[PDB]
Symmetry: C3
Subunit: 160 residues, 3 copies
């Protein structure tokens, strides 16, 4: 009950016109969307990587391949749920997740509760163990120019 481990996750996707904007499982109206072979859900990908990392199971690319017919059409919530199943099977219980989305636009505050609810459901966690934060990049860099969106995640687990 004291074998705690920490994991950390990072992801980024390009933001361009012509695709939907989906973050934390939430479709957000915007003139641009994230590019990636999946649904490009940068927040769920970062959290997934933090969870695999806390369990020392490698990373999201080692677990899911575009070539794998099991996951070919899978959205990022299905990937997060499978991640959590593998983390549990390796012997770990998740204690909490925290995260940050960095986007110059749109405003993400109205969507935070919905994202937290999706993530908590997918991880079978109480809502008060899941946190999502959001901020701009103060107009600096490709993030500040609206050319991508970044997500960071931290996860604490314990080996039971």
């Amino acid at each position: 009950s004291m074998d705690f481990r920490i994991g950390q996750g990072y992801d980024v996707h390009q933001l361009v016109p012509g695709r939907p904007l989906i973050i934390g499982g939430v479709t957000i109206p915007y003139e641009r969307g994230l590019l990636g072979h999946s649904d490009a859900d940068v927040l769920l990908h970062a959290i997934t990587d933090a969870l695999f990392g806390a369990a020392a199971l490698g990373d999201i690319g080692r677990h899911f391949s575009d070539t794998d017919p099991r996951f070919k059409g899978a959205d990022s919530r299905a990937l997060l749920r499978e991640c959590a199943s593998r983390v549990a099977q390796a012997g770990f219980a998740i204690r909490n997740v925290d995260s940050t989305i960095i986007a110059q636009a749109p405003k993400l505050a109205p969507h935070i509760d919905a994202m937290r609810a999706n993530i908590a459901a997918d991880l079978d966690l109480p809502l008060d163990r899941v946190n999502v934060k959001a901020k701009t990049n103060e107009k600096l860099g490709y993030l500040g120019r609206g050319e991508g969106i970044e997500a960071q995640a931290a996860a604490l687990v314990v080996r039971e």
Copy 2:
């Protein structure tokens, strides 16, 4: 045994005509950080880590850029109120770690003072607070000195 972790990120532009305040320390420099508050990028990152570890949202939720209450605000006062709310939520802080990334000025002479400020504001001994500082090895807008970034991690426990 109810431990929780949080992580924080912040960045502010470096501009002429502003005080440079990082970790609560007013640093002599021809430029300063631009923000609604005093724009203390390090304290904001730590504030976000603490709110995040307690699942209390983020700094924008508690101390909005849009609220005139916080124009020019002392970010140490914001950090102390953050810590008060984290305590009110049932959490004790176990440690904080952080990094400042900047091309200039030299931060080594100021790091110990930043650590002491953060420790005081969080009611922690110095040995549970850590401030790291580095350059971005000449890359990107940080390499060009256009802003300063801070990162933070916080461990809390629900008592």
Copy 3:
């Protein structure tokens, strides 16, 4: 026992011609390598900073002109870092990390990096993790101008 602490680390180095690419102690075939005073192993630097941070010992810049470390490679420095963490009364519980590089492919080398780090930190493999991804062609990382590493470390004061 229960005095846990967390640390976090970040580093980035430029990719330059005429130098070997060494990440996680692994020499990787590539026409460029990382620039730095050391061998510029950006992954070991990030982990080193996370460990110093978790133990509240400052940072890599304060720890490392010293004739003990003049020509030291990054694994010797990681080992010395781990010594100083132990000196302060801390035991390492786990390390996690991410390498961000547009090229070359790091997947074939990850297992060796983890084994190198585990040996240097005197940890079992199941307490060390290395992740790797691209930057989706964004920014200086996406243009192949540098490689970034991030790390998180958990320690306990015994």
